[PDB]
Design a protein around this nucleic acid. Structure first.
Ligand SMILES: Nc1ccn([C@H]2C[C@H](O)[C@@H](COP(=O)(O)C(F)(F)P(=O)(O)OP(=O)(O)O)O2)c(=O)n1
Ligand SMILES: [Mn+2]
Ligand SMILES: [Mn+2]
Ligand code: NA
Ligand code: NA
Length: 320
DNA sequence: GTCGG
DNA sequence: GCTGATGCGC
DNA sequence: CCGACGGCGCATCAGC
């Protein structure tokens, strides 16, 4: 991109903190820095130039000073050569293996994809599936195939009950040309905030062999593996997430699920300021005393915007 | 790690 | 066996 | 200077 070099650096440091240091807030800091610099209209000639930006503090300015001067970062090269930090990092690339388990595996001597193979017995179902499709889960999904996948899920859903509304959200709804996975928001007239619709839909998607494995399943959330039908050669296996939301709560749901995650954090933060609390369900009033007010009436994504005083931004403009 | 309080 | 911590992920 | 830093769903297993 533009400052890609800098943002790649910050992103690699973020991962290290989350995975090796288990310092989630420094993970978040580094991604906020990366976020702000990514949307900066000029070419960063210096660390000080960057330090003008909110989220970019003293330490990052130095690192950026070094990066621009040296073209690399000693902190990072130190990290790539530390066997342990390198091993822990790689392992978290398996779905279902986080910092804690990656760290445990390494202290046990399990530190490569082959070692996980030998040790399948020590992995939970989710991890086993993470290994099974390790390579495929790292492949991006070209929009074209997204549109295919969409047609398959919308049709199958309609073919369980026509009152279902399924909306593909996430980077797809933001307009990305390739996505990491597919995210589907599901609604139905019989399920509101007042009121087993997800199983029905998951079962149907299984019987046409679109959904190939399950990572988790609940009253409202399904995380699993899917695959476009082949002919020719097989498509890679893809992650799919389905989320059942109550009808009258569809607009918060789809604002949430559309993201991005950084946008969601920034919005949810800049609202608590305006005296509101936005979660994936409602946008409640923040009372003076200390408790959240009742759910405010919503009929649009814009309503949530209007509610806190943020001039609208199309899904395509929420990619932070 | 950063920035408002 | 049950369940609250904890982990992983959206 | 210090400390808060968005909000929530499901699965697992240590410790009774
Ligand atoms: N920490 C998080 C993570 C996610 N989300 C919401 C906001 C997201 O829009 C939505 C999907 O998260 P996703 O895990 O599929 C994602 F982020 F990767 P996506 O944006 O979809 O881009 P892609 O999948 O191509 O990589 O959950 C959130 O609110 N908080
Ligand atoms: Mn996604
Ligand atoms: Mn997803
Ligand atoms: Na700054
Ligand atoms: Na992982």
């Amino acid at each position: 991109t533009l400052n890609g070099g800098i943002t790649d650096m910050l992103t690699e440091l973020a991962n290290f903190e989350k995975n090796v240091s288990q310092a989630i807030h420094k993970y978040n800091a580094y991604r906020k820095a990366a976020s702000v610099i990514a949307k900066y209209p000029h070419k960063i000639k210096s660390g000080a130039e960057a330090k003008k930006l909110p989220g970019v503090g003293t330490k990052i300015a130095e690192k950026i000073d070094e990066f621009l001067a040296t073209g690399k970062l000693r902190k990072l090269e130190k990290i790539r050569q530390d066997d342990t930090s390198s091993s822990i990092n790689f392992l978290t690339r398996v779905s279902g293996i986080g910092p804690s388990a990656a760290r445990k595996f390494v202290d046990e001597g399990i530190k490569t994809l082959e070692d996980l193979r030998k040790n399948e017995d020590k992995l939970n179902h989710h991890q086993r599936i993470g290994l099974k499709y390790f390579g495929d889960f790292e492949k991006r999904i070209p929009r074209e195939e997204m549109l295919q996948m969409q047609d398959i899920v919308l049709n199958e859903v309609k073919k369980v009950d026509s009152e279902y509304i399924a909306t593909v959200c996430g980077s797809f709804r933001r307009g990305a040309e390739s996505s990491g996975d597919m995210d589907v928001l599901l609604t139905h007239p019989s399920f509101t905030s007042e009121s087993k619709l997800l199983h029905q839909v998951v079962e149907q998607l299984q019987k046409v062999h679109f959904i190939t494995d399950t990572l988790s399943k609940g009253e409202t959330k399904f995380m699993g593996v899917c695959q476009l039908p082949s002919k020719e050669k097989e498509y890679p296996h893809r992650r799919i997430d389905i989320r059942l939301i109550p009808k009258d709560q569809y607009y918060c749901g789809v604002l949430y699920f559309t993201g991005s995650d950084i946008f969601n954090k920034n919005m949810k933060a800049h609202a608590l300021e305006k005296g509101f609390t936005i979660n994936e369900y409602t946008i409640r009033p923040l009372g003076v005393t200390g408790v959240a007010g009742e759910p405010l009436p919503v009929d649009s994504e814009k309503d949530i915007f209007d509610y806190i005083q943020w001039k609208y931004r199309e899904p395509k403009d929420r990619s932070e």
